[PDB]
Design a protein around this ligand. Structure first.
Ligand SMILES: CCCCCC(=O)O[C@@H](C)COC(=O)CCCC
Ligand SMILES: CCCCCC(=O)O[C@@H](C)COC(=O)CCCC
Ligand SMILES: CCCCCC(=O)O[C@@H](C)COC(=O)CCCC
Lengths: 429, 429, 429
């Protein structure tokens, strides 16, 4: 029988709602087929995921190892013994013996049963850990793909901007050969060409970095995607009901992992309690003994045996009690671990929801800012050509425009990352 | 008796002074009452601190478990034995036996005593670890509160700046309807409104983030503080004597933790040394034996027993010596661990003192910069209205002003964080 | 004999080349003598390296501990036994005994041999870990030195820039006292002086930070280097053949560490396999027994003994098989660990090579940008003095110039760091 306490799910340590559903699979969540191809390759070759899988196998074997202690054993033994007096009759006594021994712990109070159940729960927790590694890998690959696509997009506008600046310089140069511009404007036009070449070199380096990070996550080194067209339709951003229960968090593999670890600590309390009670064992066997080897296996030399035994703990100066205290305190730690995983998960979902609002409003404002900067640039150019303002008006407007284009690219990436984090924080596929 | 070496505090591995006192309690250090209310709530509900507390309880129980091995034990045993020949007289021999056994390890050379003292020192080290978690929690809550207050303050000036920009745009619009301004100026005024809306969205997102981080640290989800007025009087920044001894570092809980771990390794050397010496044990008991169950508890079937025993290690191919080497090397590692904690602590205090100077001088300079930018803006506006300069003068001055206001807010926050880190690095309350 | 499988190096989990040699020692790689002096001091006093060294000693002792189990043991035992009936003849029986016992496990199937070989491989892996700590320390000290030198260089140009701004302000002030300038220009000139004072305070703080980080790495607190002249000749940047084999990665200590850990897991499979086979042991000794103490050591009371013994596992409900499964799965994990270290190392080299290209091209572009900005500033000043443009032209050009000088310093530092990381990623000295 078992002395373990019944499992009771701890109270939810977070609010009932995220303020004021089930995730699609990742093959539906991701629309972009290039990112899905990368995800499937990583699932096959990624070494972190492979390690996590092997840890599940190890835990299953550790369970089987512990479960084996519940079953009878059968072992053999053989011995030869020579001995004699150091003085007097110095004649040698010789005896050979043989044993075939069966052994069985009856486990009436469920000590071995619960040590086995603890290890089975560690195995279950380890499968959930593997599932967490799995959904984090999907998330990480996707983010790295959008980072690569960000580098391509930044590189593209850097190169377009370089061409624009070269055309401007050519124009100022022509104007100068007619007294229409001065050497200050020429030099201002000349400088931004060089700063833009620096930006191109930066974005080329970011692309190479993005590629190397991708190959590490994939665990394979074949061709990587070229520049793609990526936008807010590249994923199916999650649509959550207004009054979404935080109970959806309990679906996350990291939370399920903590729950099984808690069930393991419950089983360990059971094993600790059983130490106070008597333990009953049974040994039974066949034996032989003979002073000579030839008649060692003769039935005439043989015996059978059957010995049931009981051990009874009476006073142990608090060994058993300290051991139980440890098991109960570790169970309390497992409860707290479970609460920490839920509070952390709640914070992840809450932050992603707030960042979602943030990024959509920044992106909308930056798009309108960009439109105004385009108009400013066009108006500055007209006024500059007619000698009504200095070339600093054109430079200032050009610089701001290019800066805002880069910022807008970065914000759209952040939005992709956040949509992926939200999906993953809700448990992924 | 004990073979452990006497404890000797390692030499201070850092300078005597921080270049060229006792901390108040945190209820005195913090003036702002809102942050103190948050700290008290976190002390009750924070899960990290609760875990640390449970680890102290576990360590206390592990100590009690190990101490129990020093005391006599009393246990009972019962057995039934059936056996017989496989050939010849196949008649079954039957014997029942009973044992009440006392056991005692005399521990003359202090092996069990020192294994117990090591575990007591682990318990003491674990209490200090709990105290470190405690003062770090106070520090972390306070920093998160000032981060929240920074978000409110950034949001406020972003909204004020938006209003300013809207008033400017309205003015340029009126001027345009009278031929007094041109479409370039109108568009420049229009654009910064949109960039400022992007900043508002950013600061709203930072506020929400700040709030979620706060609730995670608190472990509770009630109302959070609204915007407060926060300044350099919100804490009582520490006043340190010019020639402050680095010996104040030895008060830090992380350093006290390392010291007890070192005392534990000393005890372990004692336990390892005792392995070379004889061990004396004592067993004493009452027993019965009978071929039938009914006379099993008869005094006629009973005996008493008293068996003192000595085991003497002679040659073990260097098992004992390798084990001692391990204990001595681990003690040396504990010394190095202690030195690492002190060198790290010194670096934390030294950095905070340098950052203190840095931030006060940056803040003073930025305040004077801000005053100059205000004047520049006013002068640019006058000149612009009189047609003496382009609207770029107004835009440039407006942009710089808003940027410097944000920087100044960020510097004052950094100063708060640094004052809190210094206080905590000196051991906190 | 041994049942361990032969070691087979896993296939290279990365490409054959880095796209499309041996490192010099660090005393040749580093030219700057100041950084080499710092490296030598850290090698002596750094606490992390000292800890790593002590872990090698501990592992060597653990090996010696495990190896000792392969050798015969000799131990002594002494006993006194008093006993008697609880009823009837209540006369006390007394017996004293003595034992000198030799013991030897023959280890025919290599269980103890392989447990010893596993521990020797852990020792070898630990020496490699120490070597990794060593080359990382060299890298970290060097990077911290160049960070310190960056702070000095940033501080220097900040102070030079302050002087420039003060001279400009003085000039605008003189012009104002003659009606030649207006109060807007005066205030613009005044403001940048104050922003530059903020930058000086920042760079002084960065210098102090750099110094404290350096002393922590050194483990000593003597004088630190003053400002030096540092450039691309300060190190001998590695020159790699076009078709460099990725096999150079297998020289890295972290990879060699993983390989020995894999050899340890191979030995553990051998130990696990031996559990299925019989184990043969031998005990031999001298004993005495006497009812009185005086004749306890008499040869007349003595005996000699010789007892060889065999234990034979037959059925254990899968205990042995689960244990073997665990060893085989852990070996598979060790293979994966080895592959992870190589894939990570490849990524480090690949990134450094890409960053090298990036930084050289950014630095070249920024130098040309700087040259253009100098010319722009000179042209703006001339035009401003002649009343042809506003002072905003001078301010804009001054601000950009100072920003680009700081960026260029930061890029040259990044290049130093990257050259050091590449060298270290290739295995260091
Ligand atoms: C034998 C009828 C009892 C039914 C309850 C139940 O199965 O629990 C068992 C394990 C407890 O008793 C025990 O087995 C006691 C044995 C050692 C003294
Ligand atoms: C008996 C008088 C000695 C006083 C010193 C002291 O108390 O230390 C003890 C532990 C060492 O001797 C031992 O107990 C030796 C016992 C095993 C051979
Ligand atoms: C005795 C000749 C065999 C040569 C092969 C070799 O040395 O391997 C040994 C270890 C295996 O046999 C064993 O020692 C068997 C002993 C236990 C039943």
């Amino acid at each position: 029988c078992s002395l373990a306490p019944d499992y009771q799910r701890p109270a939810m340590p977070v609010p009932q709602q995220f303020s004021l559903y089930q995730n699609a699979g990742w093959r539906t969540f991701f629309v972009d087929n290039q990112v899905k191809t990368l995800i499937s390759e990583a699932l096959v070759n990624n070494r972190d995921l492979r390690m996590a899988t092997l840890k599940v196998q190890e835990a299953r074997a550790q369970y089987r190892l512990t479960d084996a202690d519940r079953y009878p054993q059968l072992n053999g033994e053989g011995s030869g013994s020579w001995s004699g007096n150091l003085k007097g009759n110095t004649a040698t006594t010789r005896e050979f013996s043989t044993g075939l021994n069966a052994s069985f712990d009856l486990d009436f109070f469920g000590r071995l049963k619960n040590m086995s159940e603890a290890e089975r729960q560690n195995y279950l927790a380890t499968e959930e850990a593997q599932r967490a590694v799995h959904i984090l890998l999907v998330s990480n690959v996707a983010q790295s793909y959008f980072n690569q696509q960000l580098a391509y997009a930044q590189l593209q506008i850097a190169e377009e901007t370089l061409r624009n600046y070269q055309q401007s310089y050519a124009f100022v140069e022509k104007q100068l050969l007619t007294g229409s511009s001065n050497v200050l404007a020429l030099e201002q036009a000349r400088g931004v060409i060089e700063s833009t070449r620096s930006d191109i070199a930066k974005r080329q380096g970011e692309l190479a970095q993005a590629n190397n990070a991708l190959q590490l996550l994939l665990g394979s080194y074949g061709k990587l995607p070229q520049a793609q067209t990526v936008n807010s339709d590249s994923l199916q951003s999650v649509k959550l009901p207004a009054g979404l229960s935080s109970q959806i968090l309990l679906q996350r593999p990291d939370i399920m992992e903590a729950e099984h670890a808690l069930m393991a600590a419950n089983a360990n309390i059971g094993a600790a309690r059983a130490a106070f009670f008597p333990s009953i064992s049974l040994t039974s066997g066949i034996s032989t003994a003979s002073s000579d080897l030839s008649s060692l296996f003769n039935a005439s030399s043989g015996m059978w045996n059957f010995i049931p035994k009981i051990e009874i703990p009476i006073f142990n100066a608090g060994r058993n009690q300290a051991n139980l205290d440890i098991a109960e305190i570790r169970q309390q730690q497992s409860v707290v671990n479970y609460e920490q995983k839920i509070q952390n998960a709640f914070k992840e979902v809450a932050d992603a929801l707030a960042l979602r609002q943030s990024l959509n409003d920044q992106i909308s404002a930056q798009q309108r800012y960009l439109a105004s900067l385009q108009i400013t640039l066009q108006r500055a150019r007209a006024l500059y050509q007619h000698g009504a303002v200095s070339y600093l008006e054109v430079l200032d407007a050009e610089r701001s425009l290019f800066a805002t284009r880069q910022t807008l690219l970065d914000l759209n990436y952040a939005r992709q990352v956040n949509e992926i984090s939200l999906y993953t924080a809700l448990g992924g596929g």
